[PDB]
Structure 1
Amino acid sequence: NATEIRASVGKMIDGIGRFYIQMCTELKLSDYEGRLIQNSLTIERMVLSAFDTGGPIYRRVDGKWRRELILYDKEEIRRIWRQANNGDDATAGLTHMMIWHSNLNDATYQRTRALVRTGMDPRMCSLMQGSTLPRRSGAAGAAVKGVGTMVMELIRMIKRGINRRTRIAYERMCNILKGKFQTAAQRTMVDQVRESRNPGNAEFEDLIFLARSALILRGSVAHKSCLPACVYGSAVASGYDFEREGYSLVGIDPFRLLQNSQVYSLIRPNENPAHKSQLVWMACHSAAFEDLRVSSFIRGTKVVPRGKLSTRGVQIASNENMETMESSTLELRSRYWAIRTRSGGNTSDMRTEIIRLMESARPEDVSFQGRGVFELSDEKATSPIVPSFDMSNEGSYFF
């Protein structure tokens, strides 16, 4: 059923577009200045703030870039927003940029300080997908969350409490949690946790276990390709009428759109452009915890690890100066595309059950058997391509 799902989400994409265009028309920005991922970000956040303000806005004068600090009627923003969505709320829409930000943050930063202070192992990076994503996120907003993400929450919710209506949350938060697991025991053990009203260290220690079980017996976590507002604004302005022509966040749509996007970015004096583009590209698909090998394969070019990456962050801090600042054109095109999946793959004390399953598991264990990559011409999911990694690679752990 390509009617609702493909076209209803198109309508949510149209809104973001239209809005971005309106909002650019207010700031009286130029074309080059509306394609500046920097300005786009600021706008996106102005809105999510107002629906739950001012921000940094960069301008282009003969030669150099001028940063403007501006403020807008928090309500005016809310007004312009609905105008674009037919006076609707389109929570989906706000939630969408709510994720684009997430996926950018899960790739720009490593959230160790928080994991440890929670009592999670810092090496549990690949499980913190969407830890930045405000709880306000929608129902299809949490589905993108990693197993580890959920645990950090419950553990804090529990840690302060064990240190009224709050209950329905906890059970559900677990049901979701449990719905991440895709194996008997995994599933069953979550229940054994959800049994206690005042779950103390008994649980505190057990979920942490299950957290680690997912490192081997992963769960189902959806990935959503959420592009910057500018990309959708520009597309809408170019005539693309997505609600009519349909759009996806896990199909070929997002890659194809990024195959023509003209996004620019501010870039510090010593930073590497190629390295900058990489970053953004990984935020456009939630590939911050993907196997670098595959990311590079699909990308078309080296996908260098975080450490070796030359950049501190896409947003420009108030600290920096504009004199020594310039801007490059972001390389967002990719070689092939792939169905962003949700599945994690698979081959007494319920712990034992898992520990026993954990064991038989080898890192070499092939997942998504038969699934492959698609050419950018292959609109339909017709012919798949299987990658062979016998190759001089460059790692697998972005972090």
Structure 2
Amino acid sequence: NATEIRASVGKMIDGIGRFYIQMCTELKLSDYEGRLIQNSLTIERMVLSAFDTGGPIYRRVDGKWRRELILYDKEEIRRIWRQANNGDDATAGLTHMMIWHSNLNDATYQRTRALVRTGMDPRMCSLMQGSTLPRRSGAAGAAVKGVGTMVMELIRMIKRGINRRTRIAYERMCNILKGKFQTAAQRTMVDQVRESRNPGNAEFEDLIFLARSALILRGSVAHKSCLPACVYGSAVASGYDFEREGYSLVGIDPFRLLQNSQVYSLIRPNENPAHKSQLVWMACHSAAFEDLRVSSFIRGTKVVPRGKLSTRGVQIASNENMETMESSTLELRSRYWAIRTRSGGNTDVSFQGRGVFELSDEKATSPIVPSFDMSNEGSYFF
């Protein structure tokens, strides 16, 4: 059923587009200045804040880049937003940029300070997918969460308590948790945890176990290809009418869109452009914990590890100066594409028979199997 699912999500994409365009028209930005992932970000956050303000806005004058610090009527923003979505709320839409931010953060940063202070092993990176993602996120917002993500929550919810309505949360938070697991025991053991009203160290210690079980017997976690507002704004402006032509977040749609995107980014004096593009690209598909081998395979070019990556973050801090600042064009194109999955595999070869698709292969017709016998460069982005 390609009617609701493909076209209803198109309608949520149209909203973000339309809105971004309107909002650019207010700031009186240029074309080059609307394609600046920097400005796009600021706008996206202005909105999520207002639906739950001001921000950094970079301008282009003869030669150099000027940063403007601006503020907007928190309600005006909310007004312009609905205008774009037909006076609807389109929580999906806000939630979408809620993820784009997530997926960018799960790749720009490593959240160790928090894992340990919770009592999780820092080496449990690959399980913290969406730890940044506000609880306000929707139902299809939590499905993107890693097993480890859930644990850090319950453990804190439990840790402060064990140190009214709060109960329905805990059970559900576990049901979700449990719905991540895809094996008998895994599934059953989650229940043995959900049994205690005041679950103390008994649970505290047990879930941590299950956290580690997922390192081997992974769960089902959905991945959503969520592109920056500018990319959708630009697309909408170019005529693409997604609600009518359909769109996906786990199909070929997102890759294809990024095959024509003209996104620019601010880049510090000593930073490596190629390295910058890589980052953004990995946030566009939630590939921050993917096997570097495969990421590079599909990417088309080396996908260098975080340590060897030359960049500190895409957003520009108030500390820095503009004099020594310039901007590059982000390389977001990829070689092939792949069905962003949810499954963690089980039996060691996973996704037996599943392959990669050419960017011409619109339909999921002919699959391609990668052979990794090769001089690779690692598997752990972190």
TM-score range, shorter chain: over 0.9
- Three-state SS of the structure 2 residue aligned to 1:271 is coil
Distance 2:42 2:266 in 1: 13
Aligned-pair CA distance for 1:304: 0.0
- Three-state SS of the structure 2 residue aligned to 1:387 is coil
CA deviations over 1:33-80 (Å, ceiling 9, x no partner): 000000000000000000000000000000000000000000000000
Distance 2:184 2:332 in 1: 40
- Three-state SS of the structure 2 residue aligned to 1:377 is coil
Identity of aligned residues (%): 100
Moved over 4 A (4+): none
CA deviations over 1:73-105 (Å, ceiling 9, x no partner): 000000000000000000000000000000000
Aligned-pair CA distance for 1:184: 0.0
Distance 2:252 2:88 in 1: 28
Q: Which aligned pairs between 1:75-94 and structure 2 lie closer than 5 A?
A: 75-94=75-94
For 1:388, the equivalent position in structure 2 comes to 371
Aligned-pair CA distance for 1:320: 0.0
Aligned-pair CA distance for 1:146: 0.0
Aligned-pair CA distance for 1:143: 0.0
Aligned-pair CA distance for 1:2: 0.0
Aligned-pair CA distance for 1:393: 0.0
Aligned-pair CA distance for 1:210: 0.0
Aligned-pair CA distance for 1:135: 0.0
Distance 1:235 1:100 in 2: 17
Distance 1:129 1:117 in 2: 18
**Count of residues in Structure 1 that have an aligned counterpart in Structure 2:** 381
Distance 1:307 1:259 in 2: 27
Aligned-pair CA distance for 1:164: 0.0
CA deviations over 1:104-146 (Å, ceiling 9, x no partner): 0000000000000000000000000000000000000000000
Distance 1:160 1:220 in 2: 29
Matched, 1:372 2:348: no
- Three-state SS of the structure 2 residue aligned to 1:66 is strand
Distance 2:67 2:157 in 1: 40
CA deviations over 1:222-263 (Å, ceiling 9, x no partner): 000000000000000000000000000000000000000000
- Three-state SS of the structure 2 residue aligned to 1:135 is coil
Task: Give the structure-2-normalised TM-score.
Answer: 1.00
Aligned-pair CA distance for 1:288: 0.0
Taking only aligned residues, the RMSD between alpha carbons, in angstroms, comes to: 0.0
- Three-state SS of the structure 1 residue aligned to 2:349 is coil
- Three-state SS of the structure 2 residue aligned to 1:302 is coil
- Three-state SS of the structure 2 residue aligned to 1:384 is coil
Aligned-pair CA distance for 1:31: 0.0
CA deviations over 1:335-392 (Å, ceiling 9, x no partner): 000000000000xxxxxxxxxxxxxxxxxx0000000000000000000000000000
Aligned-pair CA distance for 1:277: 0.0
- Three-state SS of the structure 2 residue aligned to 1:327 is strand
Distance 2:164 2:215 in 1: 34
Distance 2:353 2:68 in 1: 52
Aligned-pair CA distance for 1:332: 0.0
